[PDB]
Amino acid sequence: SQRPTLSEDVLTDNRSQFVIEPLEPGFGYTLGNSLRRTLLSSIPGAAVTSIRIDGVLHEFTTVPGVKEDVTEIILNLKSLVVSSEEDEPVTMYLRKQGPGEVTAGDIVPPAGVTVHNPGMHIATLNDKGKLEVELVVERGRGYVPAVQNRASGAEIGRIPVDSIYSPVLKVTYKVDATRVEQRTDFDKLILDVETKNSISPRDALASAGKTLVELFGLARELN
Amino acid sequence: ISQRPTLSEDVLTDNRSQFVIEPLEPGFGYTLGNSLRRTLLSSIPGAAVTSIRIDGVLHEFTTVPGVKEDVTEIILNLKSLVVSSEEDEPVTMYLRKQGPGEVTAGDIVPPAGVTVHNPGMHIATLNDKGKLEVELVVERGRGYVPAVQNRASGAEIGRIPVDSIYSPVLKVTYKVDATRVEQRTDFDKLILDVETKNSISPRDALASAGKTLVELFGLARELNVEAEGI
Amino acid sequence: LSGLTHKRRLSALGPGGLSRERAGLEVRDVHPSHYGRMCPIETPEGPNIGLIGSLSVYARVNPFGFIETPYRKVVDGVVSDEIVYLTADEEDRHVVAQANSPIDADGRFVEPRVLVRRKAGEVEYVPSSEVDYMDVSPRQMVSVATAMIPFLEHDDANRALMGANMQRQAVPLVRSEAPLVGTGMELRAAIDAGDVVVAEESGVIEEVSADYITVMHDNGTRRTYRMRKFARSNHGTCANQCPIVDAGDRVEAGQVIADGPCTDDGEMALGKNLLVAIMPWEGHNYEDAIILSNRLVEEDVLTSIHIEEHEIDARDTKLGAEEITRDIPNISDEVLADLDER
Amino acid sequence: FQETTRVLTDAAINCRSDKLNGLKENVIIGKLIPAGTGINRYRNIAVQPTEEARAAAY
Amino acid sequence: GLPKLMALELFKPFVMKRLVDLNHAQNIKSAKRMVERQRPQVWDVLEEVIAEHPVLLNRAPTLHRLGIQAFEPMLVEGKAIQLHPLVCEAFNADFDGDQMAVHLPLSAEAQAEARILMLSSNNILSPASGRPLAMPRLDMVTGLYYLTTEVPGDTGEYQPASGDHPETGVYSSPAEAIMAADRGVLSVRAKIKVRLTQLRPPVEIEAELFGHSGWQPGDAWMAETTLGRVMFNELLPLGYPFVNKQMHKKVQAAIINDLAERYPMIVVAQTVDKLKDAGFYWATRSGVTVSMADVLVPPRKKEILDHYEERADKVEKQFQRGALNHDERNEALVEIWKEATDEVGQALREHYPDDNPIITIVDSGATGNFTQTRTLAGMKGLVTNPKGEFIPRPVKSSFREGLTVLEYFINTHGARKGLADTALRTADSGYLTRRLVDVSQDVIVREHDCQTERGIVVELAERAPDGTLIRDPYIETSAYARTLGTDAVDEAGNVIVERGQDLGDPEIDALLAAGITQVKVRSVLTCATSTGVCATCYGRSMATGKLVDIGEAVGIVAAQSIGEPGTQLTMITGGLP
Amino acid sequence: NNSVPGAPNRVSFAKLREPLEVPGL
Amino acid sequence: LKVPHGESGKVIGIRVFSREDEDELPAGVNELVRVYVAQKRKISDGDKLAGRHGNKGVIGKILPVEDMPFLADGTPVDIILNTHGVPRRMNIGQILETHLGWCAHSGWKVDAAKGVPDWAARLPDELLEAQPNAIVSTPVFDGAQEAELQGLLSCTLPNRDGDVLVDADGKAMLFDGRSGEPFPYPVTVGYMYIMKLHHLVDDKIHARSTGPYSMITQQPLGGKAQFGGQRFGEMECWAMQAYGAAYTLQELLTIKSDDTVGRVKVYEAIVKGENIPEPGIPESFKVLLKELQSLCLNVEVLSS
Amino acid sequence: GYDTPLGITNPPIDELLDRVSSKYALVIYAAKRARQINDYYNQLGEGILEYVGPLVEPGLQEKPLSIALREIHADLLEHTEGE
Ligand SMILES: [Mg+2]
Ligand SMILES: [Zn+2]
Secondary structure (H helix, E strand, O other): OOOOOEEEEEOOOOEEEEEEEEEOOOOHHHHHHHHHHHHOOOOOEEEEEEEEEOOOOOOOOOOOOEOOOHHHHHHHHHOOOEEEOOOOOEEEEEEEEOOEEEEHHHEOOOOOEEEOOOOOEEEEEOOOOEEEEEEEEEEEOOOEOHHHHOOOOOOOOOEEOOEOOOOEEEEEEEEEEEOOOOOOOEEEEEEEEEEOOOOOHHHHHHHHHHHHHHHHHHHHOOO | OOOOOOEEOOOEOOOEEOOEEEEEOOOHHHHHHHHHHHHHHHOOEEEEEEEEOOOOOOOOOOOOOOEOOOHHHHHHHHHOOOEEOOOOOOEEEEEOOEOOEEEEHHHOEOOOOOEEOOOOOEEEEEOOOOEOOEEEEEEEEEEEEOHHHHOOOOOOOOOEEOOEEEOOEEEEEEEEEEEOOOOOOOEEEEEEEEEEOOOOOHHHHHHHHHHHHHHHHHHHHHOOOOOOOO | OHHHHHHOEEEOOOOOOOOOOOOOOHHHOOOOOOOOOEOOOOOOOOOOOOOEEEEOOOOOEOOOOOEOEEEEEOOOOEOOOOOEEEOHHHHHOOOEOOOOOOOOOOOEOOOOEEOOEOOOOOEOOEEOOOOOEEOOOOOOOOOOOHHHOOOOOOOOHHHHHHHHHHHOOOOOEOOOOOOOEOOOOOHHHHHOOOOOOEOOOOEEEEEEOOOEEEEEEOOOOEEEEEOOOOEEOOOOEEEOOEEOOOOOOEEOOOOEOEEOOOEOOOOEOOOEEEEEEEOOOOOOOHHHEEEEEHHHHHOOOOEEEEEOOEEEEEEEEOOEEOOOOOOOOOOOOOOOOOOOOO | OOOHHHHHHHHHHHOOOOOOOOOHHHHHHOOOOOOHHHOHHHHOOOEEEOHHHHHHHO | OEEHHHHHHHOHHHHHHHHHHOOOOOOHHHHHHHHHHOOOOOHHHHHHHOOOOOEEEEEOOOOOHHHEEEEOOOEEOOOOOOOOHHHHHHHOOOOOOOOEEEEOOOOHHHHHHHHHOOOHHHOOEOOOOOOEOOOOOOOHHHHHHHHHOOOOOOOOOOOOOEOOEOOOOEEOOHHHHHHHHHHOOOOOOOEEEEEEOOOOOOHHHHHHHOOOOOOOOOOOEEOOEEHHHHHHHOOOOOOOOOOOOOOOHHHHHHHHHHHHHHOOHHHHHHHHHHHHHHHHHHHHHHOOOOOOOOOOOOOOHHHHHHHHHHHHHHHHHHHHOOOOOHHHHHHHHHHHHHHHHHHHHHHHHHHOOOOOHHHHHHHOOOOOOHHHHHHHHOOOEOOOOOOOOOOOOOEOOOOOOOOOHHHHHHHHHHHHHHHHHHHHHHHHHHHHHHHHHHHOOOOEOOOOOOOOOOOOEEEOEEOOOOOOOEEOOOOOOOOOOOEEOOOOEOOOOOEOOOOOOEOOHHHHHHHHHHOOOEEEEOOOOOOOOOOOOOHHHHOEOOOOOOEOOOOOEOHHHHHHHHHHHHHHOOOOOOOOO | OOOOOOOOOOOEOOOOOOOOOOOOO | OOOOOOOOOEEEEEEEEEOOOOOOOOOOEEEEEEEEEEEEEEOOOOOEEEOOOOOOOEEEEEEOOOOOOEEOOOOEOOEEEOOOHHHHHOOOHHHHHHHHHHHHHHOEEOOOOOOOOHHHOOOOOOOOEOOOOOOEEOOOOOOOOHHHHHHHHOOEOOOOOOOOOOOOOOEEOEEOOOOOOOOOOOEEEEEEEEEEOOOOOOOOOOOOOOOOEOOOOOOEOOOOOOOOOOOOOHHHHHHHHHHOOOHHHHHHHHHOOOOHHHHHHHHHHHHOOOOOOOOOOOHHHHHHHHHHHHHOOOOOOOOO | OOOOOOOOOOOOHHHHHHHOOOHHHHHHHHHHHHHHHHHHHHHHHOOOOOOOOOOOOOOOOOOHHHHHHHHHOOOOEEEOOOO
């Protein structure tokens, strides 16, 4: 008649389904929406913050030997996904010379960070030119305008880049209701979440759960 | 990230209240408000009446003899009665009077455990040589349940299920207001509003709702270990 | 598109012409002889309404200066593939059929009665024999700008004109995308626009670069094209060119080699594709207002680039000549920390 | 309004001294307009706390 | 709403002063430099210094008195000056790139001036007529219509006692009804029998159930209405009698006018704000959209069109006989096609049900008319020509089905002519307004009362030879706010309206009840004041709702009121000329 | 019927054929 | 030379022309140098957008991605349009364009095993089989008819999840982002082409509290670039008179436009805690006097 | 007999009109008191207490005009008419 809920996991390649029931009538929708809202904006992550291109003073220019200018490579690099273990700005390197193609797998990350999608295409180089790019990896949550580095007053060789710390990509839920006249009137929530492979769905779900628990703890205290 | 703690203020009235939470991260206003309202409205357990009986009437089309009020009016008057019970099984209750006069909730003989928190409430009035006997059952539950869900119930003569209200709170409303903690000047300020019955105080209802919601999200938290801000 | 429209513009005022106040109001209205020569839709919204038209798609100026319009003459009720150009006077003196009228594959008129345009403002069915001339395409009266508005046969005249005028005010974005739905007059309007380079002779590309390209002609002559990158446009926007060719491809003559502003694979692209929903939402979209998801902001879907321009000069004076110098009286070192030696 | 020279000459001949009456002239000069909160009936008001307040102010 | 980047640069001296007061800087120059650098120590002072500092907004070009309001500022991000939906009509602004300036009073006198007189909440009533202008205008009206609409045979409606089953559809209080609707067993718009306790019943039930003893809070009575109506009435100010009718735009206007004529301005503004919020909330869920399946073609238009074309061919043959000339042919064709368009429009109206979004929008008075719907679904019909005469060639297709090249070419003329007409009308109206303002500059109320006796007599309402009384169709304008010159004593010795008492809606109703027809009213045309006009003659003000106060300019108000409607004035011509 | 050599392929709701290409704009 | 009021961004290039290097220059000049400043603008509030059917608008608000309504499969929408403006303006074409765009984007496959449906008789034989993100083109006055759209919308390829989102009519079921519950009725969705107009917001926004004053007219400069105040038309004077507001008009005409000593004193008083002194004699009146006294017309004051 | 308002509209306008003869007089009748209050604040450091400070206890850094309007609603001021 009255039992506490329980959460179980149904697994797939990269997107997992979570089933929660039994819930009281007219209550699954709100819980699912709250979880979705807290999942898509308050999951900590790490992403590139600012780059440093040797032999280039700003972003509105080109570099000999490449097929696309600086703006295109910045746009391509925005797709890069990295996970930070240290809580301080770390530095990576990207040195590729000669004809061929330069991909995400040519970066030499330091200790405590990794690149999980080596198949991305950054750009291509003609034999004439070379390339050496240094980039930073800071840890934040949400979304921050690139201009943050403008006020730091660094040297000319620094180019700000927009940071987007979010491993979650899409979330959806459907409720399976049971509106029989019996006291078994409940609903079954079916929540599905997919991540950018930076973290498995379980970690993100646990982080969101902890965030909401800490937020709602302020009400349980006797007033 | 610790960020900034969110304190829950409070305002007081006769039986209403305006609880205020300030400040909140941008977008968390509704995320709290909606779920908290739903929890308050349909989570707190309570007790109420489910069915009644009138030996003086065979069905509901007519009205009980010797009483000014009508059957529907009697049902409405008896539905709003606030009853608190501590026993799970459905217990019975009897109301009986004779001669001219009025009838009050306090005059109903309560069995052990069950109590009525409003004895001065009016139900109906009797003329000279009037009589009415009622055998109403009381059950504990949560939220609201209509009588349609209680339609199929054994076989009786004059069983008349009535829409029960298994909740001590009956109205909730909330808004969101912008706030300026920094140059962001977009932080939300939840403004809750609750109006409970006489069987619970707004603040204890809110504490119970928060307890229930935290217990529910304990399942989500327990799947792994990871921390966040205050 | 704006440049092409300006080059195709037909002014009616200025030196040697009537003024705004003296010009009659009637001249600003349409005339039954405008069909095929001047578009009736495209027009400035301001007070200069009706005084600034635009050539039709197929309009060509005769050597004297009278606009013409192609037509195929029906000799004995059979359509003729060969076409001729007729002026206003000759057009009035003949019978012009309707392009949309059904015609059999053999050139036989299935309908005995076909609508027709007559001397002036007269339309009436006639036997399918006396008809002499037939139009070429249904799009023979629209302008270049108006010719690329899908479902133009369903909107209103004022709305169509407003959309046509709006199309000439787009802003080049950073990452353009070709429209999913659009008329077939997009690539042609882009090749003729001049803002996209194209190979002259069918050759094979040896190497390509972000700044220049080198194509080898089949006759053994090497040629190089230089593409301006991030040069301020005449109206403050930016202009760039990104080659869309790979190394080691035998590019045929007439094939686009680079895409200029508002282009995607050699075709016009003035905007992006967004998922729209039609419903009033909490009054935030009240009275023509619009709501946008933050995904567009955080993904540079509608991010543009604008280039300013400033200039200073040091001109001689009777009291002396001014000279630009790093030093400046009574200024802290921090203020001039950016100026160089010169 | 119109024909400034003629009316100016006519006024000067007669030495027509005119009070600052009406709005247009009074706004051209810049002085407070003689309307709304500008009429002398309200521009000269003396307000002080009632004696009861002062006795009970402290 | 004001962007912070603008407010901070606009309150620079006040911020600097308050900051140097708080010892965040040492001098004025350092404070100015820090404000220039925009350190995070400035935002708090900026928020503290604009607590009750009003600002002045002005949409360019201002036209009438209400074109310059005075709103309280509020910090918000972005680079757009936020605004309230209900004031856009005052400026006649459209949220599509319009720009307005923002001024600021400095001295303590201008602050009080803009806080008392120019405040927005005290100018609900337009100066043209003593009726409110800031009312639900466009979208929220649809939401209110949907909320107050009634439908039969819904879910959870009231039913009668059927033998062994009780009568279902009765709720103890609105809270239980709301909870039931939330659960999903009661549609928001259905017939219910709720038991209200804090809403005065209608007079017809108030005088009967309670015997006129007087309703007070805490008295219960069994109502018969729909939950939507109760939820709507809960927004109205307490004590107002229950309203239990569908809310068409006319009903909305009547209710708002009654509230303005019976309650103070502040209560009216508060209830209007609450009603706007409720309408915005409930408009989204009304399910009003647009799709191909919504614009439905008529079922039997083809037969009617064929018959009318056959008759057109008949008259064409008649002309071919040569008896008639071109003019008669044109007249016959135009009248035939007008009749055909009317018939097709009638058929199209008879076809659509009461569920299509187009019908719901048009019938609810939200916007548009039926002619646009007919053009969009039925027939566009004959169209104007550059000469103004109707072309003998009518269009036989709607925009949904798709026009042809010839029809569009013919149609362009109307749009061109309308554009030209608007272009000339704007300037014509502007010049007329300027002249009208010029002529009457120096009219001001000087004396309180000229104690004159000449009062123009106006026929209030004529008494029909067969009927008892017919209200004059222009009493709303001639004698609605003028001060009653002499008491309109009824046939008997009792006085219904006393001398000097200003007229109004309740007093007009009382006079109508008394059957009085001819009334002598005090008017300003016969004011005996040497300069300007005495306040008594002028009568009840427009924006104030009461008698005009001494010193208030009236000439400017009259000029603005008469000149504002000049924009829509179009064609011995009958238009603006 | 793509006159230009390598334009993108986008089939059209074509029902009638134009007997002449658009002249040089 | 300094950056004007309301400009920022990188410096991409500097061009300097010197007469020493034998560079043609305008007569009487020696060194003309021009600097280009390039700024990247992201679409923000107060920006114009409009489709190809002439439906302008402004960005009322940019909600977070977590708040917008989302399809049943979790695909949040990118823009929401009002509905009351469609039938009044009578631009139904955009609805058909949106439907066709959705159909082309989702890809379709018209059934042909039993034969071409009557509504698909005139469709080109190569247009019966499309791919996701396909490209379609409808020439003006000759395009897909209503029946063509009706047929196409009934054969769209299903999502990778195996379910079809939109119905035959073209509407779909959404889920509110705030409440979290589905809307009672379906809504129309689809892909529509959106451009970007040149009437940006950064150009329009401007403020001015105190700055350079004109030397010939003693009035503040004009224009955003010059950092000048806004104009004050006479209609504003009429409005102020209408309300009966006097001191405000006095300030606007005297203490904030012309009176030099007035400006200095009021600024100092505001800087301190002192009350604003009453305005003085506007420069316009004194100029008018000293000019009319030049025509032999003795203009006295008669302070008495 | 209505919900308490918030913002600059408190106290309401109709209540004040019950005291003052006309709205045009009230603006000056309050502005002069605000001027006196500001003068008293200026001399708070040292001087004569002839311009008695606020009658009603002020809030947390409220503008003097708000104090004047809120105390006029309390009927604590007396004034003479025009001259
Ligand atoms: Mg506009
Ligand atoms: Zn009088």
